[PDB]
Structure formats: C-alpha cells, structure tokens
C-alpha cells in the first residue's frame, strides 16, 4: 500500500479542547494538552516515537505529597531557543512545572503570581516574562532561571513584548502602562525598568500599541472642538498623512513588511478602506473588516471574536500577492499580484473534474475566509492556506458565481492564484507536506475513513482508507514547515462518543523516490502574470511523482530584472 498508518492512539480522553506541539528538531517529541474550552480539568500527554504511542503524564503534574489534589493546566509554553524545555502553568494555583528534558522529568515550583500569561525569550532560553491578569495591580514579572524565581518589574501594564532583534538591543522590552485617562503610554527599557537612563518614553497617551518588524504602530486620539503614529527603523514616531474626505474611526494593520504597509481604515459610515505607505495612497475600498466597536459589530461574530481582524490574506512565500474579500450590502473576492497597486476579479476554473463563468458577465471565483465563514456559520472551515514551504501553492474553500454561496468547494492554484482548478466538490480539511509535494484532504461533516490525497497539485486524487470504521474528524495537520510526509488525523470514534483519537498517517510511498534535477523547473510569479517586476523559485514540476527530502532547502534567487 502507498500509505501506512504509522500509529493509532486512542487517548481515553473526553476533553473538548486539544492543543498540540511538535518539538520538531528531528526530535520525535510531540506534546499535547487536552483541556476545556476557554477550565475544569486537563491531561497532558507526550509521545517520543512521533505519535506512534503516547504516554499520559498528568500524574507527574502534582503539588507533591500532603497535597494530593489534582492540577489543571491552563496553557503550556515552549522555548523558541531550546526545544528541549517547556513550562506548564496551573490555571487556578500560583504554580509551575518546568522541564529541560522533553518532559521525562518535571519540577513543581511555586510562584508569587498566577501564571495567567507567560512570554519566553526567543534567544535567551533561561529568560521569560510573566503576567497576573486578574490582579488589581497588573504586575509584570521576570525570571532569569527559566521560571524558578521571579521579581516584579512593573505595575499597571496594558500590553508588553520583547524587542525585535536586531532592531532593538538585547533585553529590550516594550510596554503600555495605564494612564488615569484610561489611555496608556508606551515605554522601552533595557534595564528591565531598573534604570531611568535606559527607561525611555516612546509615545504619550495612546489608545493601542503594535510592534511589527522594523515598524512600530500606535493610535493617538485627538479630540477637537469645532463641532496614526508610525516608527520606521525606530526613528521617532510621527503621524501619517491620509488622503480622505471622510473621517476615520478605526485603524488596523493588515500586513507589515519594510517599505509597504497595508492598513485597513474603517470610517463613521462603517465603510472600510485599504491604504499603502512607503504617506498612504488608496488601494481598495469596501473591504470586509471587523472591529468589536465595530464595523460589523451588530452581528454574530461578537461572541466569537474579541479582537478585530479582516478578510485579507497574504500569500506567504511571496511578495506582492494578496487576496481580500469585498462587501457592499454580498461578498466577492479580489486578488492583486502587485502590493495593492492594482486589484482584480478571481478567474474561475475552466472545468469541474466542465463549467461556464466569465468576468464580463459578472462572476468570478470567490474564496471564503475567516470572517465570511463565521457569518455563514462555517465555524470549523478552513481559511485560505498558503505557506512559504510551498511558494505559489494556494488551497481554499469557496464558490463560483457572483457571490459566495452557502455551497462551497475546494479550489487549488499552483499559480499564486492566477489560474484555479476545481479540486474537491465538498468542504474539506486540507494541508500539505514535503514542501508542497503532497496534498491531503478529508471530508467535513459526515464521518469518514477516507483520506483523499494528491501528488499533482490537485489535478487528480486517490483515496486511502485510514480506518476500518468511519470516524468523525476534527482536524488534519502536519508538523509545521510541511517538510515531512507524516500527516496527523485528529478525530473521535463513533459512540461511545467523543473519545479523542490520534491517527498517524505516513505517506512517503505515494511519492516513492527521491527527486532529481529532472523534476525541477525555475519559476517566478513574474512568469505567471508578466513578465513584470523579481524572485525565482526552484519548484518540483507538478507531474513529478517523487520527494524532495525533509532537508530540502528551496533555492530562491533574488535579482534586478
């Protein structure tokens, strides 16, 4: 058989929420937190054979003898610097558990505060920050020994983050401290606020603060009487000019890369618009946007989203290609291969696997995203998928016509969106592995035991039966980076209902053989719509059945055309 089921693990677990981490440094370690929606109880599991088997380690999370009482894990944290180490915060007690060895050994520690929210440094593996949210003071804490001892470094804090290397020096911290106005002022220290000399105000009386790569952002409120601020390369913050006749109510940073910023602007009228810096020219108007305030506040979403967001997708591996949703009353999708320079209607596929659709008539391909999905109640449905591991490969759920229907299919383009095909009729979970070399999908709704997969960019599909009995499926995932050919199917057996189930599917033999240079082509988004200006990617030709390795290192060449 082309596909092996590497492991079937029936955790005897009835928790509704499942959080999964891959240590993933070629360590076959996988950590899983089973818990309640956001908590009454929890169970932590761990695999060392890459999901072949799972050891339940909840009993190792205790407060010692003389204190039998069971613990409840709210969240668990990983070190971005050292995948060996993890931290487990109790939800109710001011207590931790630390690990330096892939959870083979844990140490129960008391802490001065409840571990509501922790932030681990990306480089200094022993260094982290802590926050007590339901503490009247809003205290911020620091640890140098990876969470064993703590000290308090600030009070009345609204938000905070680490600096961003290399832009900010090591130990840099940005925070919003609450002002009696109810507003906040943004600080920056390197002495962890033990030194006034290194403490440094960067803005005054600001509504919100966002740190993004080179740029920094913040909304200043100016109340006039007669009836946003930007940093660039850390140069002091100055307000940006906007070309409008209508007043502005809400700001949102859609995408940040050096030299071009995408900002959604929602007005009094509840119309939302898109601007681009380098000073903000108008790119696109009436973009589907939400804020709690809010542009779409009245509706359903309010009970689902507390933080604003917009139907605006950046195709990840690329520069310049985005996909957004437009609304009037009434949803439609538009794509730009320029960074908002021009926009376009998404050309529907040429067949079904045939069908008629034309831009002049008024119909185009329409892709359902995060926001539009909640409105049509597509709670579990997939947002647009695009990853740097597979440049110019996009899979999405959407419809063909003049409007996003309730009826939706799966659409694929290995053309950065310029050309689409109809891949799957229903809605499916989907993901991919081996740097886009292989695509798996599973049907949403009725319980299945079919794993549809494809090696030629969705052109054809094959079915693999992964279970003798059909199971409900809650998710289909890969180790991030999508280099492996292992796919994890999360699901539950039929009644007795809701017993978590983790199937580990291994699809190398679908690919079969290591790729050679014969199966590689050069390709730039320029090739698709142009030539126009570039970045050139080596891609496996679509019809090549083989695998680039897990250690595949995609060669990208940047050039002045």
């Amino acid at each position: 058989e082309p596909i092996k089921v590497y492991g079937q693990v029936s955790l005897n677990d009835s928790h509704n929420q499942m959080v999964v981490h891959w240590a993933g440094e070629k360590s076959n370690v996988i950590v899983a937190l089973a818990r309640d929606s956001l908590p009454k109880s929890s169970d932590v599991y761990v695999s060392y054979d890459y999901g072949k088997s799972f050891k339940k380690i909840s009993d190792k999370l205790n407060f010692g003898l003389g204190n039998r009482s069971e613990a409840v894990i709210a969240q668990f944290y990983h070190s971005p610097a050292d995948n060996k180490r993890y931290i487990f915060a109790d939800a109710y007690a001011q207590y931790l558990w630390i690990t330096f060895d892939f959870c083979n050994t844990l140490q129960g520690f008391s802490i001065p505060f409840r571990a509501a929210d922790l932030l681990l440094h990306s480089k200094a593996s022993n260094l982290l920050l802590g926050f007590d949210r339901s503490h009247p003071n809003k205290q911020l804490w620091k640890s140098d020994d990876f969470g064993q001892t703590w000290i308090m470094i600030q009070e009345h804090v609204k938000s905070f983050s680490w600096g961003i290397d290399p832009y900010d020096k090591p130990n840099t911290i940005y925070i919003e401290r609450h002002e009696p106005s109810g507003y906040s002022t943004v600080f920056r220290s390197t002495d962890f606020f033990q030194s006034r000399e290194n403490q440094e105000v960067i803005l005054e009386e600001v509504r919100d603060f966002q740190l993004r790569d080179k740029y920094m952002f913040a909304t200043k409120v100016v109340h006039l009487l007669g009836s946003l601020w930007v940093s660039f390369g850390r140069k002091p913050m100055r307000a940006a000019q906007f070309v409008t006749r209508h007043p502005i109510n809400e700001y949102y940073i859609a995408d940040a890369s050096e030299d071009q910023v995408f900002v959604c602007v929602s007005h009094s009228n509840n119309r939302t618009n898109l601007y681009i810096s380098e000073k903000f020219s108008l790119s696109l108007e009436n973009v589907l946007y939400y804020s709690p305030g809010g542009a779409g506040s009245d509706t359903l979403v309010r009970y689902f989203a507390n933080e604003p967001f917009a139907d605006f997708h950046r195709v990840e591996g690329l520069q310049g290609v985005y996909i957004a949703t437009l609304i009037n009353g009434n949803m439609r999708s538009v794509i730009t291969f320029d960074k908002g320079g021009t926009w376009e209607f998404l050309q529907a596929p040429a067949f079904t696997g045939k069908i008629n659709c034309e831009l002049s008539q008024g119909c185009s391909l329409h892709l359902a995203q995060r926001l539009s999905q909640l409105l049509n109640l597509q709670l579990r449905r997939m947002p647009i998928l695009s990853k740097e591991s597979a440049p110019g490969l996009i899979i999405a759920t959407g419809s063909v016509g003049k409007n996003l229907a309730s009826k939706t299919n799966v659409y694929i383009s290995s053309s950065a969106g310029a050309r689409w095909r109809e891949a799957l009729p229903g809605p499916h979970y989907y993901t991919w592995g081996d740097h886009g070399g292989i695509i798996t999908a599973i049907a949403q709704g009725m319980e299945t035991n079919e794993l549809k997969y494809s090696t030629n960019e969705g052109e054809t599909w094959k079915t693999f039966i992964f279970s003798e009995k059909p199971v409900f499926v809650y998710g289909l995932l890969t180790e991030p980076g999508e280099k492996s050919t292992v796919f994890t199917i999360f699901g539950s057996n039929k009644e007795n209902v809701h017993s978590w189930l983790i199937l580990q599917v291994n699809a190398t033999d679908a690919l079969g053989v290591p790729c050679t240079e014969n199966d590689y082509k050069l390709w730039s988004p320029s090739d698709e719509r142009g030539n126009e200006c570039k970045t050139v990617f080596k891609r496996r030709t679509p019809h090549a059945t083989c695998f680039n390795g897990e250690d595949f290192d995609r060669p990208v060449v940047v050039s002045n055309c």
Binding site: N16, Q17, M18, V19, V20, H21, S37, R380, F472, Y474, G475, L477, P480, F490, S492, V497, H498, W500
Partner: peptide, 7 residues
C-alpha cells in the same frame, strides 16, 4: 469534542 490547535 470541538477543536484542535497548534502552539
């Protein structure tokens, strides 16, 4: 049963 998350 509800959902599965990364992170």
């Amino acid at each position: 049963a509800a959902a599965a998350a990364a992170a």
